[PDB]
């Protein structure tokens, strides 16, 4: 009937709790579509996933599909202005990104629900007539180069590419997907290749409607969404491109029974075991790979990990199936290594083959499969509502793998137990099919190969036949048993009736010396879940570096100790986070409310009765020492942010201080520390979800009673409940702190223009200014000037104080970056002076939409409340109040704010810059004053005043 529509999908199977409405279709040109109607959504969204990616790059132009992905954003025939797309989104509360994998290129945006058609039309042009403008190409290739650089000294990316480099060099798996300036400009130029031409040729050949899937989510009815999508996408051309397939495994016989020894950048020790396996995707209804991953990767009693951990050889383990491409996959078992584990790799691998032999001996276990199936069913049913942008992106990817009607269920629900497929995969997990990689600094100076794209130093050796034979003869080890039935599975899903005295925001329902309890019964989501958040304050958690180390080690040891017990709860949708903070400890229990009290009670009990295992102690301490050392290998912009935090906060122990004090942490000292820590506490809590006032009070009393019983906890004095202040910068001051990154050959910078204490007015002046410059900052400093891949601007909030920050990572020296940011500020001043009242009000409305955007799930709402609580501002109605004020601001207000606080000649400018030099290290910029160079952070802070702390609302 409608010629542009080939078929309309039958009922799209969805969760019973999901109120969104769905319609699937296939357009005449072969585009698979899902429409999602959600009349409540504040932001609408679209995504399009093309089933082509870097495995299809030309062999002589590594990175082409990725580069194309960048270029699509930079202008189309209908909208040739280079940043039209980004500017429109920014002016309408939207955002966009994309990624390129081996087989997919996935583009997505969100936007104010009133402006879906406008964004979608601009988006659709990417897939119709991109300019691939020559000047944009010559600039944007630097962004891709900078992206690659950032990855060069990253251990994960190094390993990722090294695996590719050690399989069949003729297989597309071997390709370098990112590209860089060499592969996308220099080499093509020397080969007489026209890169713009190649980009157009690639788009023409592969951006075909038959390889595309689109998802659109908006307030509109399904009928209107249907017409909108037909209108904008039926013109995409169908080239009837065959879908690439890779039936030959990149790992052939000569790539098996191989051992690789690799030098990492960080001081890390890891073991990677890999087996090639057939593509299991077509078996998704039974998912034999997930069954085997659940078992091999299990962390409960009887598991492979448990025994490896008891032997003192490894701390963590990931096991299971890993994606390859259509035609090939992998099965992995990866562990970290203790110092002793590094000496026992052959033994560790033996134990892996013993556990696998145990699975073979027992045969496939239907009760295991059924338990997984039933947990998946529960998870699907009570699934949190997703944010639109991520949801559209994810669905567009999976529309390529499942019928329209099954796209929502396909990745949750398991259907048939197929013991024959399980045995088939298990039959692949054999020593004659193994690849082994050991990552360790101990191989430094002992390697003889270098991977070309990253520079990775490694060695390859055949694994001796005698070793393979021993693994082949792996027998049953009495330490390994199948998991026991999961007893944490929830069974009570009753949603309690909303209480008569229920409140819209959290209410303070307990307020004593020991505890302050905030409570809200969920009145939005009505899923059988709750969030239980606790802050335990103690001055002994951060008093000196040694105590900070001890607080960290205590909680790491506690989690390590509880891990076997809590893993089952995890699997059953009940999880917890436990960490030391600068003020004490943070505990959060989340998930199904049914068995929450049981897990929470176990944690508090364990906390208060904790007995440390000496061997776990030494192992965890050694890992922590390396973790502190390894910060040296983090990115320059991460260094910059870290130093600014240290500089601007009243108290903060540095990594160097922490590791100096770490050698001194002994088992006896840690044992003494714990009772001291627990002896006096104040507890502030937020209990939010499917719970009543009475259960909330009962939970808090149980927590208190348990510490009182086992730890003899008593309340802190109110005077002891100190929070830290931010350093108060002098009017017209400019300070610079300079450090070097010894690992990366890029610099980083953060510039911070401190404004004043947070308040309704100061907050909204700053947020509106940030909204206004946000997209222009990126367009100018990255897209035009190409200073680096990482360019960020926005509000910085800490310790009740705030200001504007820029962060850039670049090949250029930080002093150059400073001049360019300063040049940009002047451009923005003029831009704000010239902008129409209409444009200005668009920015106000965009910020308004962002601030009023409703939480889609419980934990998003809890996090808002939690922010108000830990900041001690307690302003739960903030968004309404601050947006109402925002709407009264004028352009003149913003200009005055800029002139008073931010401009280079501003009377109240307060500037601090952190410059992180690389390892080896146009509008007019203004003249800058001479900075005061910070030589010593302690001296810097001593010499300045400290702000007051903000008052509670």
């Amino acid at each position: 009937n409608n010629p542009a529509i080939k078929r309309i999908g039958n009922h799209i199977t969805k969760s019973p709790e999901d109120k969104r409405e769905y319609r699937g279709l296939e357009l005449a040109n072969g585009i698979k579509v899902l429409l999602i109607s959600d009349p409540t959504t504040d932001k609408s969204s679209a995504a399009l996933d093309v089933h082509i990616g870097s495995l299809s790059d030309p062999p002589n132009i590594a990175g082409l599909s990725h580069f194309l992905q960048h270029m699509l954003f930079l202008g189309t025939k209908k909208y040739p202005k280079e940043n039209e797309y980004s500017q429109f989104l920014s002016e309408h509360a939207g955002s966009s990104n994309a990624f390129t994998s081996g087989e997919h290129t996935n583009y997505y945006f969100d936007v104010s629900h009133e402006h879906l058609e406008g964004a979608l039309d601009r988006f659709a042009q990417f897939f119709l007539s991109p300019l691939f403008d020559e000047s944009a190409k010559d600039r944007e290739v630097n962004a891709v180069d900078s992206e690659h650089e950032k990855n060069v000294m990253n251990d994960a990316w190094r390993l990722f590419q090294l695996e590719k480099a050690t399989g069949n060099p003729k297989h597309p798996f071997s390709k370098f997907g990112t590209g860089n300036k060499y592969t996308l400009e220099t080499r093509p130029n020397q080969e007489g290749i026209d890169v713009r031409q190649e980009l157009l040729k690639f788009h023409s050949a592969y951006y075909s409607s038959n390889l595309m899937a689109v998802v659109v989510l908006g307030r509109e009815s399904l009928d209107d969404l249907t017409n909108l999508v037909v209108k904008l996408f039926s013109e995409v051309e169908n080239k009837n491109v065959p879908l690439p397939e890779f039936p030959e495994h990149p790992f052939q016989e000569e790539h098996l029974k191989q051992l690789y020894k690799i030098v990492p950048i960080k001081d890390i020790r890891n073991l990677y075991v890999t087996f090639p396996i057939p593509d299991l995707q077509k078996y998704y209804k039974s998912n034999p790979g997930h069954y085997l991953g659940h078992l091999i990767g299990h962390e409960g009693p009887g598991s492979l990990l448990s025994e490896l951990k008891s032997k003192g050889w490894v701390n963590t383990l990931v096991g299971g199936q890993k994606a390859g491409a259509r035609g090939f996959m992998f099965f992995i078992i990866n562990v970290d290594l203790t110092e002793e584990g590094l000496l026992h790799v052959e033994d560790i691998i033996l134990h892996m083959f013993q556990y696998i032999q145990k699975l073979r001996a027992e045969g496939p276990q239907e009760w295991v499969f059924q338990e997984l199936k039933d947990l998946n069913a529960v998870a699907f049913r009570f699934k949190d509502k997703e944010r639109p942008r991520g949801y559209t992106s994810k669905i567009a990817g999976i529309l390529h793998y499942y019928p329209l009607e099954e796209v929502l269920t396909a990745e949750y629900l398991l259907e048939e137990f197929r013991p024959d497929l399980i045995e088939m995969v298990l039959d692949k997990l054999r020593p004659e099919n193994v690849r082994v990689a050991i990552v360790s600094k101990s191989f430094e100076g002992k390697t003889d190969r270098t991977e070309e794209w990253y520079g990775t130093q490694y060695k390859q050796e055949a694994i001796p036949d005698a070793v393979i034979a021993k693994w082949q003869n792996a027998a049953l080890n009495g330490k390994f048993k199948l998991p026991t039935k999961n007893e944490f599975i929830p069974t009570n899903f009753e949603i309690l009736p909303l209480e008569a005295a229920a409140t819209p925001y959290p209410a303070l329902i307990k307020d004593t010396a020991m505890s302050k309890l905030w409570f809200k019964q969920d009145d939005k989501f009505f899923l059988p879940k709750a969030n239980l958040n606790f802050e335990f304050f103690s001055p002994f958690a951060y008093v000196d570096p040694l105590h900070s180390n001890m607080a960290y080690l205590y909680l790491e040891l506690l989690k390590d100790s509880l891990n076997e017990y809590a893993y089952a709860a995890e699997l059953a949708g009940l999880s917890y986070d436990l960490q030391n903070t600068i003020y004490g400890m943070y505990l959060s229990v989340k998930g199904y409310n049914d068995k929450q009290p049981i897990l929470l009670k176990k944690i508090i009990e364990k906390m208060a009765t904790f007995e440390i295992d000496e061997a776990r102690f030494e192992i965890i301490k050694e890992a922590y020492m390396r973790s502190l050392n390894n910060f040296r290998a983090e990115q320059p912009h991460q260094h910059a942010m870290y130093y600014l935090r240290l500089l601007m906060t009243e108290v903060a122990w540095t990594k160097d201080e922490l590791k100096e004090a770490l050698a001194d942490v002994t088992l006896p000292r840690l044992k003494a520390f714990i009772p001291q820590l627990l002896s006096r506490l104040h507890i502030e809590a937020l209990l939010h979800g499917n719970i009543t006032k009475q259960a909330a009070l009962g939970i808090m009393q149980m927590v208190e009673d348990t510490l009182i019983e086992h730890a003899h906890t008593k309340p802190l004095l109110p005077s002891q409940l100190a929070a830290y202040r931010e350093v108060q910068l002098p009017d017209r001051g400019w300070f610079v702190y300079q450090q070097r990154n010894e690992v990366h050959n890029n610099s980083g910078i953060e510039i911070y223009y401190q404004t004043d204490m947070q308040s309704t007015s100061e907050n909204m002046f700053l947020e509106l200014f940030a909204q206004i410059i946000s997209e222009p900052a990126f367009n100018t400093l990255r897209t035009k000037e190409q200073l680096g891949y990482i360019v960020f601007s926005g509000p910085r909030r800490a310790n009740g104080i705030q200001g504007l920050r820029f962060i850039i990572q670049s090949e250029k020296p930080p002093h150059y970056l400073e001049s360019r940011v300063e040049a940009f500020l002047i451009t923005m001043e003029k831009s704000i002076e010239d902008m129409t009242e209409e444009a200005f009000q668009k920015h106000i409305q965009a910020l308004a939409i962002r601030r009023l955007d409703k939480p889609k799930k419980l934990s998003a709402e809890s996090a808002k409340y939690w922010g108000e609580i830990i900041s001690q501002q307690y302003n739960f109605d903030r968004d309404n109040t601050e947006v109402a004020y925002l709407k009264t601001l004028t352009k003149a207000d913003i200009i005055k704010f800029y002139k008073e606080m931010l401009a280079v000649d501003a009377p109240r400018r307060h500037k601090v810059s952190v410059h992180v030099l690389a390892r080896e290290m146009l509008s007019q910029a203004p003249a800058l004053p001479q900075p005061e160079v910070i030589q010593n952070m302690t001296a810097f802070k001593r010499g300045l005043p400290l702000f007051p702390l903000v008052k509670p609302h």
Partner: peptide, 4 residues
């Protein structure tokens, strides 16, 4: 853990 299983990978994802």
């Amino acid at each position: 853990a299983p990978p994802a």
